[model samples]
Target chain A: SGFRKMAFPSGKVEGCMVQVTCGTTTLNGLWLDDVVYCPRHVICTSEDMLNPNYEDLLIRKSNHNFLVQAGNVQLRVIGHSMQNCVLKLKVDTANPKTPKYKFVRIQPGQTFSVLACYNGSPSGVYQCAMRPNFTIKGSFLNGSCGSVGFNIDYDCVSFCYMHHMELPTGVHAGTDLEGNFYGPFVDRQTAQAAGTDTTITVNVLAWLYAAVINGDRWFLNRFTTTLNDFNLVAMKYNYEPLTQDHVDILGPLSAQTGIAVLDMCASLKELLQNGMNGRTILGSALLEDEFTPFDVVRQCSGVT
Target chain B: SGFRKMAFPSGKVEGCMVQVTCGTTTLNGLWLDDVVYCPRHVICTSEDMLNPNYEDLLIRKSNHNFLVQAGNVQLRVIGHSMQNCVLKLKVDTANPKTPKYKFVRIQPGQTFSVLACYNGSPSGVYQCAMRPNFTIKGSFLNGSCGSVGFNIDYDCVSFCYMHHMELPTGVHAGTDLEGNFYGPFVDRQTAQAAGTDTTITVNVLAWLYAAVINGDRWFLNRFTTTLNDFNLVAMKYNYEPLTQDHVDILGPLSAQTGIAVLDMCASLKELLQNGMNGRTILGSALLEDEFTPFDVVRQCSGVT
Candidate 1:
């Protein structure tokens, strides 16, 4: 790290401009003073904050068709085809009490993102990107075609915020029917290939925790005893029980749940290797079919 | 989606376990009822929560070298090398009032992450990871080799948390000395090739915002007017003003800042293209040298 070792802030603020100089080029854009702290609602205030969820590629958008829609965020290159094509963001900020707004105008081969920030009343941040024939949904939106010169809306980009248990980009959306949800992948064949076993393992553990918390007699009888066996069988990995630190963190909460919280891990190699419906026998007499992956996974975790 | 076409929860909770049967396979892991909410503090209550900061890479770990320290998360192919290798996580949660805790035990070819959760006294989550030879800083830790069977602490992994402005993995520790910080890359030559113009551009704009908000005479004089000229010059792209929605989002906050907030875009291709000292002048008489980059960017954003 070095220092400027020079004078600083020598000029005065006339209107709202910074009257400084740099070499021979004039560079002065947005003055932080013009905007407020963070977005009031849907609009973002953090210069670093981005939308389309965390991955910045709304995974849900491509749910319509994931095959031809898979996209990599790292795949950025400007094609001469749309080098000068104007890409627009028709932002929907119907508020008149706020500042003046305009449609974003950028060449097709560029990045464009916006966070809706309105301080007047509560507002929603909804945006659409248009580049020639395609339209995608997302706040931070950009896409380029090698020969085709258009940006595909989030619908064509594949990405998911699965934490460690991530899915391949643009995987087909899950089908929710008859009270059961299926296929974030198309089927067992696809899901197995997609390696959603990690997802299933974690969710099954979650379901087990819920069962104990809700006082399920069947699960309670065998698992109530504290032992490493539960940990060994669930995941080839041993159980790491919650520590005093965990207790302090949960406070009034851990009292609500139980001790099974610490046995969660993403390693049940054999059962998981069997695919989505991978099943395991418990401390009691049971077949793999009665207790399935989905019936007792995140779907049953009961949290959105 | 298919269905079991059978009834669930047939058994009642004898103690705290599920009394129902899964065909003949009995699977009972952590029961959700045992845990409540998320970690009250450092302990995570959510089954999905992970530590080591977002990308779960915690790029800061390799701040020591970044070269010999680089590692990839996707590189997970366990060798017979560490087949039975036992990796341990000695969690430091000196909590006495919480639940029982144990050090994590996993074979080298595995993944491990933890979020501190404690409901008492508002605890802090500070953890250190250790493997055989190297120790890294991160909650999520894993590593393997063709013959050596041990996990390297996160320190050996190459990862960063730079949104779109990501640097090369395990690039190097930034140098902080004198009055300024330097060298997230070694120097100008490396930095230019590093393509940090986007970071510089974004930071410079943040600095300008602070200038206008703080009312610096030098910056205010040239930037006060409302026009796209500033936008066109800073970045080849045109200006995009804030709309009513932005206003509504910044209601109380907008009163503190000004219009300069809207022109913030990551384009300024030339000024940024010029390297760290990339300079630019204003609407007044000034040289590019006098106006600089870092003096006016996010370092001045005044937010953590």
Candidate 2:
């Protein structure tokens, strides 16, 4: 709650307001820069425009002129002037092309605030002024109307744009395709055990099939890395080689195709282990009738 | 199975044999240009080289010379001459520098086929030659042996290279944070429900918080689109507005912070629904005591 602070430009205090003097204009008269001999007090750059007490009062009552914590910039004004007034804010005035401004109307004895965000230069300078007629007033209160400064100190590691959802890393707790529960199982072996659901393995197989059929060498490289990671994780759990039962679980696939799938995964694991290219798998599917896991599923499930 | 056809080039028959005649050369003689007899049989152009019947035999047994189906090309040589023979194929003779060739040693009464995939042109020409020496032979296939022609009909829709995975479009089936099955749901809504776990919402919130604190307008636009999509999906499922109960569930967050969170979400939904800029939510998170969803999750789950 206390993070909001004034980020001021160079050579500025946390609690200064703009200074102004009283002046006036006549109807059908040329605009005058400085004027005297007026019945009513008009905001001007004269000595009467200096109100250091009112500037201090505004800063004391308003939260705009204080140092904000990291990642916050806001301007506020309190109606300590005893009348309803409109507050105007000008921020980052150094950049005239895209300077920011906010107007807040506050009732007497109320406080109004506007959220201000600036991420440009090292810091941004801001000024807040209040008047009943909403006329543009020159700096008077401490040289500028409730001046403040702020900066952003937090920056994230910018991510290169991604076209696909990234696979989350680390061990995850979830159920297998047959709804069997497991925890902290690293890689595919948890559900890939013989006589258990081979969902993870099948998903990998389907992805590999896509890579193979498309001759996508890039996808094959990625798949190989993941396969290597999975292999290491599986070995950490004392993974065993595929057995007759595991082979049988592949089921009803053309015998040659079944053997090829197993051999491919095995050889891919070793290739990945050796940091060699597993690119041969991409070619295997094209020159042969390599049915993907999804294809096998659809055929076995009678979906097509 | 029937799709294995000519993916071949230049003068070749898809299903025919190549013929050759023997001539001689002296062992010590300089290699003469288009020489005649010595001791070695030199294959050359003669009247015996003209066999419309052999051409018909090639065109008869060969699939290459005939028009191929879209996306197909093949080179086949049947050793119908009653002897084991070496079959050599040269394709795309238009390019003399890098023509593709294949040599197969065919057994007696056997046929050897080579799949040729050429997508660049509508058709390609090929030549097949037979030699006894088994030496790497040049483009004399049509002169002494046989030749054929073919083309590749299927052209893959080439995808431009992308560095990251692409998001899949349309409805998908999946489970939410609590493992409750749902969907036919779009990507951004699976875990955005009001009462159940707010994992997806929280992730979005965290991202938005980053956008706000850093004033990342670009990231803010992307976040807003996802947020709007989530809001619509949630509404279709009759999800309610964020409530005090929901805030309480976030845990250990100050009450004011919780209220602010709800207000921010509500305002963002409206802003998105109205097709308005969501820069406000980003600034709000910075100006207040914003606790990221990860912080909330860790606090509630006692992870930290």
Candidate 3:
């Protein structure tokens, strides 16, 4: 290939037509910034440092719909109307001192759709612009003039910080439910759309390392043996282990990896389509879900 | 340098120790999202696509400020007792449509520090922090407190859509009539101790470039071919080209660059030290002025 300067030639004009044949569709007037608030308590701070619970703080704010209600928070614009506005909610109130907070959204009937109701805390943010139900382009996709329904049920976890009496902006008039909790998503369709087979990998290697550090044999088994197979089946169940012949043995493996059997399945499916081997059985079993594209062939051989 | 995996050797610690040195000096509590109102004005809209006067919009807000005793309807943090406080202000008026803003800060009790007092919107969401002035090796080096007659003066520029009104934020509300334009630092002594050079390069380049673009024969004669020489002499003035002779030429150039004469000189000094060259000198010269650092150098240079 001949060397060339890093430049592209200008596009040439097409033959002139008496009338325009196409119009460019651009969605404007909206911007989205995902703010997650995780609630947690800090039992101690030797130095003036950001408490370890800061992550929870952000998660809690997002849960309370502060991102949407405070000032001008808007979703990314695709076209004219409001599209299926999806709100991916997460909260972790597991820590006692610094409570972790997460929220799931379930709503409809407010010019947007309710997608799904997931159960988790401070999870990843995702969208459902491409789904079976969402056919309208841009803002006016899915059902109704906008997209889907509202007031759907989604699960969440919140911590104690939200219960604090005072807030910088003003007095906390609402209860703990209002303090850290938020009515996520303007509608419900957004939640459902996010419920699709999207899987995220949390590094369980650290858990294995932690297990080794503490001389825990439980971790070694989960790591050296089951983990290799665990990830392949995660996307299958979101983060939950599905009952199978060996589920009793496999359940703990998936749980240890911080992933569900369904999610493992999804991850395995993705791994195979991109060209893989050895774990063919895992890939085929996972990829052929009802939601997967028709042309995609799942293979247990890890090869299509 | 050979790379060794960018690792830290044994006996090394990572992270900042901002806490150990928290409370020596401070500014008034910092404010965020402070809103400044923009005066209404009519401009050509894209729908009609008529050419409009940019000046009209800029002056619209300026004139609006001038109407009240308060000058313009400016937004700022209103508080007292900044002796040991750090004021971090974020202006939302940068690009109101998006999260475009700027952050400006000030220490307590210096001259009034100007934040976003410009005509245009801020470039982006500006983020700045105000902290207690740190002591350099246990001595107040810079950003300390309690300098009475302090004030700052700076201008801003932004592009507004025909139908849009721009608001300014991240501003300091206080002012001292007798305070010089530059008062954030305790004094010239502290600035020198901190080794903060007053001159800047962009201003110099503006003077120089103005000469090039405007085809100013005299500016061209003095600086176009003498960039290196100007740079050499600028070393002593901290690379600020000062001197009655320098300014006589630089003054006109600064004007051409739309920079104040004094500001132009100060900017020039900074540019030279920073080693940003190959700029239009004429533009710089036109912007140089008497109160500018260049002017200070010129006044002192003759006596020296």
Instruction: Name model 1 segments beyond 4 Å from true.
Output: A1-304, B1-88, B91-196, B200-202, B213-215, B222-254, B259-304
- The backbone clash count of each candidate, in order, is 118, 63, 147
Task: Give interface RMSD for all predictions.
Answer: 27.6, 34.9, 31.2
Q: Candidate 3: interface RMSD in Å?
A: 31.2
Per-model lDDT: 0.20, 0.24, 0.22
Residues B1-304, model 3: lDDT tens digits: 0000000000000000011011222211111133222211111223321333434433333222221111123432232111111212223333122222232233321111111111221100111111112111100111211111111111121111011111121111121212122223321111122233334333344334433333333322222324455556466755344455444655554554555444434444454345323332222212331122232222212110
**What ranges in model 3 sit over 4 Å off?**
A1-304, B1-84, B87-198, B222-228, B236-238, B241-304
Q: Looking at candidate 1, what is the lDDT of residue A194?
A: 34
lDDT per residue (tens digit) for residues A1-304 in model 1: 0000111010111011111111221111111122211101111122322221322322222211111100111111111010111111111222122212222223211222211111111011111121111122121101101101111121121111000111232222211111111222221222223322221223234334434433332333222322244445434422233234432432322244544333222222322334223221221121121122222321123111
| Poorest 10 consecutive residues by lDDT, candidate 1 chain A | A1-10
Worst 10 contiguous positions by lDDT, candidate 3 chain B: B8-17
Tell me the tens digit of each residue's lDDT in model 2 across A1-304: 0001111121111112222121221100000111101111112223432332333334433323321121132222211121111122222222112122222222111111111111111111222111111111111111111112112111111111000000122111221111122222222222322122112343234434433333343423323234455556435433333334433444444242333445445544553345323233332211112233433333222220
lDDT digits (tens) for residues A161-185 of candidate 3 = 1111112211111112122222221
- Worst lDDT 10-window in candidate 3 chain A: A8-17
Q: Fraction of true contacts reproduced, model 3?
A: 0.00
